[PDB]
Amino acid sequence: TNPLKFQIERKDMLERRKILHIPEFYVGSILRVTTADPYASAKTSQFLGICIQRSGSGLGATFILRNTIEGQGVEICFELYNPRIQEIQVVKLEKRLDNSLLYLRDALPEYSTFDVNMK
């Protein structure tokens, strides 16, 4: 049962890693995701933002991205193994203290001081 689920994970990761060269990223990293999904005339949709939360599960492993657009906060969750995504580029790399960036919802300057502190 469980080792068969591990086999599912292995098979999925093989299928994805062969076709997709997308590098490994972690929570609190500034990324740019290309998307061919929408119906817009331009096939390429570039979304720049920092990943607030990533919980890997099976083939359905997803990561949530967040950024400030035109004064309004925009949060879009993408599937890591989603074939709709063309590529992903890492503009910057951060760490913080946790895989949960939810504390950034308040956007306080003190927490930003800590944000700048660690590597």
Partner 1 sequence: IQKMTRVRVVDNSALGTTPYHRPPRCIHVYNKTGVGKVGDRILLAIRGQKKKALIVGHRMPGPRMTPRFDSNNVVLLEDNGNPVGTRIKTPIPSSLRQREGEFSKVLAIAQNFV
Partner 2 sequence: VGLIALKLGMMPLWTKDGQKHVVTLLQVQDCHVLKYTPKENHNGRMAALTVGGKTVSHFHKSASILEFYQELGLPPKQKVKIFNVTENAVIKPGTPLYAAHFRPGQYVDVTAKTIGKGFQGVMRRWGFKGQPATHGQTKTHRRPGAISTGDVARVWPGTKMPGQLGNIDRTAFGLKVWRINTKHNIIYVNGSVPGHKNCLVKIKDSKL
- Tell me the two tokens of residue 30: 């500034």
In the beta sheet, which residues pair with residue 67?
A: 74
Residues 11-40 that bind partner 2 (CB under 8 A): 37
Of these partners, partner 1, RNA, partner 2, none, which one is at the site of residue 53 (CB under 5 to 8 Å by kind)?
A: RNA
When the beta carbons of 4 and 116 are compared against partner 2, the nearer one is 4
- DSSP labels for 66-104? EEEETTEEEEEEEETT-TTEEEEEEEEE---S-SB-GGG
Stretch that binds partner 2, among 19-27, 48-56, 80-88, 104-112 (CB under 8 A): 80-88
Which residues here bind RNA, judged by CB under 7 A?
53, 55, 57-58, 60, 62, 64, 77
